[PDB]
Design a protein around this ligand. Sequence first.
Ligand SMILES: *[C@@H]1O[C@H](CO)[C@@H](O[C@@H]2O[C@H](CO)[C@@H](O[C@@H]3O[C@H](CO[C@H]4O[C@H](CO[C@H]5O[C@H](CO)[C@@H](O)[C@H](O)[C@@H]5O[C@H]5O[C@H](CO)[C@@H](O)[C@H](O)[C@@H]5O)[C@@H](O)[C@H](O[C@H]5O[C@H](CO)[C@@H](O)[C@H](O)[C@@H]5O[C@H]5O[C@H](CO)[C@@H](O)[C@H](O)[C@@H]5O)[C@@H]4O)[C@@H](O)[C@H](O[C@H]4O[C@H](CO)[C@@H](O)[C@H](O)[C@@H]4O[C@H]4O[C@H](CO)[C@@H](O)[C@H](O)[C@@H]4O[C@H]4O[C@H](CO)[C@@H](O)[C@H](O)[C@@H]4O)[C@@H]3O)[C@H](O)[C@H]2NC(C)=O)[C@H](O)[C@H]1NC(C)=O
Ligand SMILES: *[C@@H]1O[C@H](CO)[C@@H](O[C@@H]2O[C@H](CO)[C@@H](O)[C@H](O)[C@H]2NC(C)=O)[C@H](O)[C@H]1NC(C)=O
Ligand SMILES: [Zn+2]
Ligand SMILES: [Zn+2]
Lengths: 937, 935
Amino acid sequence: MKYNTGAGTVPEQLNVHLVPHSHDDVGWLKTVDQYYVGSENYIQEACVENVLDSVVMSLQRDPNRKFVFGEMAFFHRWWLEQTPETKELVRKLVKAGQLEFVNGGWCMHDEATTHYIDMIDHTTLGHRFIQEQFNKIPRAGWQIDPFGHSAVQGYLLGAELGFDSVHFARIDYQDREKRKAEKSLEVVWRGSKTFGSSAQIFANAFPGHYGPPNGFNFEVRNNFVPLQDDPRLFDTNVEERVQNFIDAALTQAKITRTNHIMWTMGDDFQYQYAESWFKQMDKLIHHVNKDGRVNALYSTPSIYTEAKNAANQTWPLKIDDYFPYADGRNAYWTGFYTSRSALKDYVRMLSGYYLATRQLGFFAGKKSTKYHAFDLADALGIAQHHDAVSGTAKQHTTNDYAKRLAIGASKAEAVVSSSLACLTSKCSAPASAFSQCHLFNISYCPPTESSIPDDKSLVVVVYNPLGWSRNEIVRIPVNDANLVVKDSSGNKLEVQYVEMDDVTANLRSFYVKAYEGEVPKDADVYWSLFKASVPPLGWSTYFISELNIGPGDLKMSFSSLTGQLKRMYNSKTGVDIPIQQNYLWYESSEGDFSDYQASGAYIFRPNGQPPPHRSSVTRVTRGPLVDEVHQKFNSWISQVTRLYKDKDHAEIEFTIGPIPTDDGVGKEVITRMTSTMATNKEFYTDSNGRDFLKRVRDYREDWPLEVTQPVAGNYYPLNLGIYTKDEKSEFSVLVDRATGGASIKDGEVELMLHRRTIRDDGRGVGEPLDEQVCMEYTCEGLTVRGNYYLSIHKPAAGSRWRRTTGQEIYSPMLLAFTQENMENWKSSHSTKGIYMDPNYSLPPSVALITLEELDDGLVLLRLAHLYEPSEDAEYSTLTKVELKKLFATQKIEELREVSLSANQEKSEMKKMKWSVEGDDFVVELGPMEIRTFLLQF
Amino acid sequence: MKYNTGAGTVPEQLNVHLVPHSHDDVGWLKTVDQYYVGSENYIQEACVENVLDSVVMSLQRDPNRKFVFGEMAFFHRWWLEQTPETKELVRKLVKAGQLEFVNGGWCMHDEATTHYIDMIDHTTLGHRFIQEQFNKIPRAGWQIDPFGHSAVQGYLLGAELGFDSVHFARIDYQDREKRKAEKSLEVVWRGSKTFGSSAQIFANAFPGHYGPPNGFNFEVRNNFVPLQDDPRLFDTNVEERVQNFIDAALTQAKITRTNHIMWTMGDDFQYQYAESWFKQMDKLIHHVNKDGRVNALYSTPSIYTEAKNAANQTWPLKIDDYFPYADGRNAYWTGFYTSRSALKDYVRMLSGYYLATRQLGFFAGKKSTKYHAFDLADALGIAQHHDAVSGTAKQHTTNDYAKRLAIGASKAEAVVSSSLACLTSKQSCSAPASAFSQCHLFNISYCPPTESSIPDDKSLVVVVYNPLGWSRNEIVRIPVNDANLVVKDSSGNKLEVQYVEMDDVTANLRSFYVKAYEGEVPKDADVYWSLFKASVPPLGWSTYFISELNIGPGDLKMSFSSGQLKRMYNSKTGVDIPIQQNYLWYESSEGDFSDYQASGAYIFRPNGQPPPHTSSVTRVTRGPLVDEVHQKFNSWISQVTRLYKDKDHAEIEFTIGPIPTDDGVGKEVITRMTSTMATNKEFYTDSNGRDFLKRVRDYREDWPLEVTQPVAGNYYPLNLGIYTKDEKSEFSVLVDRATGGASIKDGEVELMLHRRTIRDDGRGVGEPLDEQVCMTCEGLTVRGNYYLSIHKPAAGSRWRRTTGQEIYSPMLLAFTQENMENWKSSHSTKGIYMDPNYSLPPSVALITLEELDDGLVLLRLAHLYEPSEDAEYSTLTKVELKKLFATQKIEELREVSLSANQEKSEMKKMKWSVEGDDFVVELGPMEIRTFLLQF
Ligand SMILES: *[C@@H]1O[C@H](CO)[C@@H](O[C@@H]2O[C@H](CO)[C@@H](O[C@@H]3O[C@H](CO[C@H]4O[C@H](CO[C@H]5O[C@H](CO)[C@@H](O)[C@H](O)[C@@H]5O[C@H]5O[C@H](CO)[C@@H](O)[C@H](O)[C@@H]5O)[C@@H](O)[C@H](O[C@H]5O[C@H](CO)[C@@H](O)[C@H](O)[C@@H]5O[C@H]5O[C@H](CO)[C@@H](O)[C@H](O)[C@@H]5O)[C@@H]4O)[C@@H](O)[C@H](O[C@H]4O[C@H](CO)[C@@H](O)[C@H](O)[C@@H]4O[C@H]4O[C@H](CO)[C@@H](O)[C@H](O)[C@@H]4O[C@H]4O[C@H](CO)[C@@H](O)[C@H](O)[C@@H]4O)[C@@H]3O)[C@H](O)[C@H]2NC(C)=O)[C@H](O)[C@H]1NC(C)=O
Ligand SMILES: *[C@@H]1O[C@H](CO)[C@@H](O[C@@H]2O[C@H](CO)[C@@H](O)[C@H](O)[C@H]2NC(C)=O)[C@H](O)[C@H]1NC(C)=O
Ligand SMILES: [Zn+2]
Ligand SMILES: [Zn+2]
């Protein structure tokens, strides 16, 4: 028989847009490559190679069929294995619109724990491949699975990508009930207070899930009811299946606006045998349309969106974001804002390093390796997946993520070392030219711990990947107490020696072996500190050879008894608050009689009894470069509070772990900073590191909140920081990794820093969050170390500290080490230098977030304005960058402004119109703008 | 990557022949149509449409890939749904050898409980379709799942089909161990004592199962190890999988002759997503061959056999058959020789009816409907499947089989009625199906056309059609309510009649079963049976008009006590044996301390207790047409022993059921005939109704039997009968349906007639054999006949063959009520389609006569006798086709292969080295000859 599969939409009927899809997690229960090749099916039945193999075969059979695919990490692995004939067929299918890419990033990223730079990076990696191979520009965002949604997702990784729509299944369960009653599941979303309706997007929250209606999952070997329409066979059932379809459509139509609804015909790793789905949908389209009561068609989320836009219809407005997400009264998905803190820091650390690596590679003329096997672009792109950096994957998968990142990091280190060798010489240089250290956090740096030969110095090359001037304390572990530090002009520098401590020494013994395989040499005896001063986008070289604290304007007071913070004050600016800082933990709920929901990798459900709260100072240190207060809170919680020279903030280094759980009680550890500030239930948290959103305790803008979790319901994901304010003071906290934050009482701010549960939370990963480090065999709970940064300012002056320090935290100095005689080094190498015009800086409002060599001589460049319109009187203004002065040693031959993911000419982007309820080479940038360019030299 | 998938065989290496396949049962746990469309997957995950869909897609991708498909019932359903473009692609794939048909019958038939006529019929149905669509002749037989194997399967449904080989997984578990040790899994099999090496076949018993080696099942969503050969991905494992492959190959090579082994790369309903399998096989062929230690290739069973034949090798000989089959110590698969007796009888009845239907349709010029939806050809072909007539399907599937047969039977009944109305009319086709009425529930006394009153001036007209090519006299026995009826022949003479009174057992059956079968309660049980002797020419009709203690009317006499049988003797021939007949039942094992195995639909495992025992005469009847003894053995077992006029045998009618199981004891019911004949552990049973094979109690020719089941291991499948003999007597028993039979003690013969168990036997059907009828449910009751006689040595074979054919092909009765003189005025009361006075020789049966498409007529003649059997009839003979078709003129005649897909003269045979080595149709013993005719 011939089936009428070419149906389109019809004006006077309900139209059911059938959208075939396969939700393909880039790692979760299995690793990425296991998901691809289909191995380890006893863990989960899933093979992406089958999905792409069989979808292509099924699309070829009938030109009216469609399918949407998203995750280029999988698509690219598949593409490279395909014959020239299959590639030709795919080009034909894509050109005809049978295979449409939605999202099109390397992965479907989490929106809570990801930084906007990494979001842009992997989205560009996928989009460039799609543009190059198929001359296609994705128009529909696909966020069907991520656990809540960010403002930046709507306007920046939505509107500004050129997407007309974004689609997602998960919103708060109370919000969903209201949105069904209001028919407000579909909205026009304006995620930027700054850009408003100029960066808006059609946002489609599905009624329930991203699967088909009940009885319309057609995966091979499932117990579905086939449509039997052959009269030569027993038990035809055409009428029954058509009525099944109509019934489900009419139910959806009652909670949806216009005469178009969308069915997401697919689920996790479905379409292993695509024809099993396409057979039934062929028959349903045919027989439903013969019946004619409703209308069915093969469709895509962009065809659906075009239909919704063409309807004469006015749409509800959405502002701000969809955080936090809860799918039940005791199930707030705010635990994963912190889950796997060590992986989250690893991602953030490598993201900064990768930004500097790409700068240096460009300046040194190194060629792109973005699509080579195991490149850092692949590993960091994968790491953005909504089970990866979010921390909601199985342990073995998580280990695989870190293995991939380590491989990419090792390749980046060689690029950085070889580029610095060419660039400082007065590119072919071997990676052996410089050594580098990434284990300063546990005091492990062989290049600086090693004895310096006679008539030689330790050469320290310091590279600054910011477009700003920067001074900064260099802090290296050494074994000689009588070292002299000279700058490049021969001046001896003021140094400070800091003694090794026992907490770090025990970390060093355990973790160096865990990471490298064997025990290191003795815990070095000192840290040597000195202040480096480095040009923007450039380097300097240094030669090394044989109760109250605060060396600058900011001061802290501590109890001499329970050595806890009591006060912060700035002498020069005259801000002064009594403030206490302590460590607590919530006990993880394991459920009860009325609700068995446990706390786990996704969900934070505390017991509801007050968080368990004998600290002592074990050291006070004073010196010209740092004042430090070592605090011991218990045997597994220790902290060093550091006030460094010329730093307008305190650096609070935490060390948490092993979290003891032999007592059978999960523990989720917070730092809490308590003041008497009249914060009036308000607190501010960032969106993917950009806009700050005003959060209000126990309040929701879009629905009348029923309070069920007075703590977990007030946690928000941080990637830059959290701040509060009253009439007199602004209290700001910046993080060094994705972190959950909240204000549970007025004047009080807390960060959740580490979590270990005994139970799984029943959302599919099947594992308690029980991170352990092992060795014969000596296993213990994981220990995390990091910094948070706190400061005080007068109203309207904290903004510039948050933006400036946030960028310095993101992009620290890079240190490169070698041992050579100073005289001979100076005679063969430039010791100070700049790739920009000498004496040029980017404006303090701007950051160079992308500088990267692509194929040919194409260079990708992105500049971001860091401030929102009312943040800083001086910096929240129009500014300019002189690209000629950015690129002093070269001459720009062509400049082309492009879309954020660089797959469109900027001037050719067009926007849909919506009716919404309630309605020289100098680059200018206004607040929050990001501009993207392709250059030729 | 490009994979090197085009490998052939290489001479100096072990060759692994990868044969992709999907074992698709034509009904079993789901119905045929559920298996096809993929519904009810909660019962079993299985969709044949996906198999053919995805296999065609995978073969199209790479011309070196191959796949073999068997069951045309499924292929034909799929074919009718395909587009022109898909049909052309299949034609290309078949023409290229990528898709090869193995077996090619409508199904893969059971070999135990099937009749050779039905095996030929469904096989011709599939082979004609394959030949017509693709111009292909299958060369490899495919019996991978049937539960043991028959002699007729080897020589007739193998060699005589033109197959060079036949392949199967199941043989006896003791026999398999010896064959592994002797490397005699593969043999040259000569299943015919008569034809020997002239009808031989290469028989390949697989090492264990028809699946892949462990770790080489690649079905979508299974937990196999994919071969990961991309170095851009983690965890490449090429070397490991190549070694996995080599290891499995070496193990099989240790028990196989030559440098060629075969992997059956598939299983039940596999290849739902074919590419999952072909991806792995592509990679294995490529990397195994790059490795070079062994050689792998896409192959088929016929390519494999060709390599076995080209090898320098002598092969062990196989004679006779592979029955019975056991897969373990207490697991003889001999229960299904009886299981579902009522379905087995239904199949056998409809087979004989369908033979007569095709005769009459040809004579009346009716058009062929063989490939029409729900035709009897489809229903009877499906019924031969190795879970269908064998009785080993689920109950719901079993009901579906019977539903389909009933649809086909209704269609054939209309063909028979319309055809007879045209053919008996004086001016001879337009006649309506309403012209005649017909009755198929005589067994429960239900025949409205004869029970109803006859109007005045009218007679009950009885047309009697005889589908045998022999003259036949037989007793017509119809249920009537009038005691003063007269029966006149066509000349007007009154015939001798005998009235038999209704009995309570049959009346109790009638009320229940008519309502069950027809949906409505019938009128009062009829008061009498009217009996008269009819005499009909061969392939012709006669017309009759109806209006207003020692027994035996003939030579054969039987003695009973005043109620058990005690003696049979024939005064005229001089045979005389004391013989007792009784009913017993084995108690079904439910497992014991040594072995959990239970008796079930497949496996007969009796309890180890001796069979419990049952008795009184309820009626003795004497008359000129029949003497009868009615016997009640218990409340659920009764019998009528009947000695009819001019019948050289007694006809024993059994009625068994409901078998009571509320006591928790399953029961397997036998009739046992006990004599003092010195049978010396020997007894003879037929092969699919044809050759008789000599069975020896507790003895196996091919291996030294370790006796573990002294009863179940001696059961054999019957489709014609069982007999014994000594120096003085020959004792013969003929069945009316597939039945299990045995001789457990010398001079003793038993039939298993009905079985009801409380447990399943753990071979996959998941159901106790617990048949019930409902409206109110009770265990199923079966009624039927077995036939016994006694003869001098060397003259019982004549009775076996003659009576066997008469049982298979009884008269057809057609009724109408009209005035006798009026009927004779517009109808011929006598007729014959052959020449007047022409008869087929007594040794020959017309087993096929049917109109095909266009003017094409298919004819088959069988010589019924083996060389040893009858001095007069085991001889060369001839049929004159000009006299066979008196009414017509032969324009064209071609002799063809048995399944009519090859010209006979063009068939070629492989040569093997075997250890130990006018239109007149002549027929030698056991020959079957097949012709295509045009008129
Ligand atoms: C003696 O001899 C004989 C010979 O002759 C033998 O044998 C027998 O025979 C007979 C005849 O004669 C037969 O009968 C037949 O049968 C068939 C079959 O049956 C079976 O099956 C069925 C079906 O089944 C199915 O279905 C159901 C429902 O659903 C179920 O249940 C089952 O299970 C199955 O299922 C499956 O399949 C399906 C598909 O197919 C699917 O769907 C599903 O899912 C699954 O899978 C059934 O039903 C039945 O049952 C019944 O019966 C029984 C007994 O047998 C009982 O037990 C039961 O209970 C029942 O009964 C009840 O019910 C009913 C009904 O309601 C009532 O009536 C009663 O009363 C009671 O209550 C069985 O099981 C059949 O088919 C047939 O039938 C037919 O025919 C009649 C007359 O003849 C009538 O009545 C009916 O109705 C029918 O009709 C139809 O068809 C025809 C043709 O055939 C035509 O013509 C007509 O027209 C009609 O049609 C049309 O219409 C319809 C209506 O509806 C429709 O359907 C359509 O569409 C068309 O259009 C008959 O019955 C028998 O079988 C035999 N047997 C054996 C065992 O085989 C004997 O045996 C002897 N006896 C001594 C020896 O004793
Ligand atoms: C099969 O193999 C046998 C074993 O070698 C071959 O027989 C040998 O071949 C020649 C005779 O043709 C002589 O050199 C040997 O005396 C033979 N030996 C035996 C034991 O026969 C045989 O030629 C091969 N081919 C065939 C068709 O038999
Ligand atoms: Zn997901
Ligand atoms: Zn089978």
